[PDB]
């Protein structure tokens, strides 16, 4: 649950000299003092218990553990981290409106890509090399990520459908009457049909528009995948 | 262990009043001081807490402005400040002994009653 | 936050019998540690709230053992075998898991003869 993350460190202490038979350790107050404490300013206290452990089978082994649950304070990566990261993931869809004819959509899909994949190795640098969980946070990035990489397959595709001439390229039946007939139809695009070259610029657009409606169904379903982090 | 509260409180609308909660017999500074709240007709509403050994408060979303809390060290004792006061606000407040995830709220004030009138 | 309901509002139910309250909540109140941090309070008239059950179950020291909770995720009941005249008050929910800590509705135990 990074930032939002609560953590359960434990002192553990005991005499390395002295077993159970020989000295007994017992706790003068049930939980920890914070009499003298400095507020940390990260880190959010919120219990110190203190218990007495011992070990019904060995019968020489005592100890007091001190749990000491953190909540951290999550404002400075709420700020730093997670806003920085909707913005860049905001950026996923608009490859999917951008028109062909402008040249841009590989530059714009593909700087999204290294930007969620800089704002991952980050994650992974502030987070221990563990391998039990994974932070919500960089799932959501890398599933981010994933759909990045197939918009690039995509827009790759509708920019080779795009630049087909009747020169080059010959329209199958089938894709007439699918792209220009209904599945516009659908989107609501209703071509006005008031020039074959046209027709393949229409197909490509068209293509584009209905992965724009996958990418935000999806993407705005992708806030369970986030919501559930706060 | 033992808690004990002001006594009761009258103040006009639109005041403001401080009550304290003294605790004694454990470890004040590091166990949370939840304030409860309840309205004479019915049910029992938290106002937050404050752990007076660090600063830390919470408020839930209701009371949030209305009231706030500060803990003094020296004096085993927290205060909670209640902001324009109104008519729905009178009731008896309680201050109570939590540690979240352990032991739980065992012991409690002897409660404090404040009415509001002109 | 988490909001916590109880049913029914009054449980009437005369001397010697078994009662059931039940407390339910808007999302499961279970908690990484293991553990689930609902507890039930009694409030006899006139006096503050003393503490009964906590972790659904366990029973605070000291109270009758007539007393018994238990439940699971988000249905929870409390259940008391054989009331008396020092049983009567209100009963309330308590959820200790989700930051803001919030309070049940509250069940108005009443006796019926």
């Known amino acids: 649950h990074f930032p939002f993350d609560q953590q359960n460190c434990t002192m553990k202490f005991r005499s390395w000299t002295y077993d159970r038979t020989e000295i007994d350790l017992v706790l003068k107050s049930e939980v920890a003092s914070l009499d003298d404490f400095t507020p940390s300013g990260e880190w959010d206290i919120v219990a110190l218990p203190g218990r007495r452990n011992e070990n019904p089978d060995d019968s020489t082994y005592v100890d007091i553990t001190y749990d000491f649950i953190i909540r951290r304070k999550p404002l400075f990566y709420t700020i730093n981290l997670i806003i920085p990261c909707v913005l860049i993931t905001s950026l996923a869809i608009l490859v999917f409106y951008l028109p062909s004819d402008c040249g841009e959509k590989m530059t714009l899909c593909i700087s999204v890509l290294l930007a969620l994949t800089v704002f991952l190795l980050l994650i992974s640098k502030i987070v221990p090399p563990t391998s039990l969980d994974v932070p919500l946070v960089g799932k959501y990035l890398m599933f981010t990520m994933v759909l990045v990489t197939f918009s690039i397959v995509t827009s790759v595709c509708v920019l080779n459908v795009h630049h087909r001439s009747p020169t080059t390229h010959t329209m199958a039946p089938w894709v007439k009457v699918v792209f220009l007939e209904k599945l516009p139809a659908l989107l609501f695009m209703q071509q006005p049909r008031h020039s074959v070259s046209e027709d393949w610029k229409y197909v490509a657009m068209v293509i584009d528009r209905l992965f724009l409606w996958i990418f935000v169904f999806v993407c705005v379903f992708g806030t369970i995948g986030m919501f559930l982090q706060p | 262990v033992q808690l004990q509260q002001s006594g009761a409180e009258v103040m006009k609308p639109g005041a403001s009043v401080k009550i304290s909660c003294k605790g004694t017999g454990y470890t004040f500074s590091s166990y949370w001081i939840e304030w409860v709240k309840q309205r004479p007709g019915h049910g029992l509403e938290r106002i937050g807490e404050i752990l007076p050994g660090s600063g830390s408060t919470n408020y839930n979303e209701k009371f949030r402005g209305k009231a706030t809390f500060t803990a003094d060290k020296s004096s085993k004792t927290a205060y909670m400040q209640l902001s324009s006061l109104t008519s729905e606000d009178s009731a008896v407040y309680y201050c109570?002994?939590?540690?979240?995830?352990?032991?739980?709220?065992?012991?409690w004030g002897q409660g404090t009653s404040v009415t509001v009138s002109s | 936050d988490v909001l916590m309901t109880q049913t029914p509002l009054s449980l009437p139910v005369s001397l010697g019998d078994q009662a059931s309250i039940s407390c339910r909540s808007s999302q499961s109140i279970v908690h990484s540690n293991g553990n689930t941090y609902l507890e039930w309070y009694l409030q006899k008239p006139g006096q503050s709230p003393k503490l009964l059950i906590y972790?659904?179950?366990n029973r605070f020291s000291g109270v009758p053992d007539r007393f018994s909770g238990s439940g699971s995720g988000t249905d929870f009941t409390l259940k008391i075998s054989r009331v008396e005249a020092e049983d009567l008050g209100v009963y309330y929910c308590?959820?200790?898991?989700?930051?803001?800590?919030?309070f049940g509705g509250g069940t108005k135990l009443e006796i019926k003869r």
């Open positions: 109570a002994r939590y540690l979240p995830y352990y032991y739980a709220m065992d012991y």
């Open positions: 972790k659904v179950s």
């Open positions: 308590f959820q200790g898991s989700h930051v803001p800590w919030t």
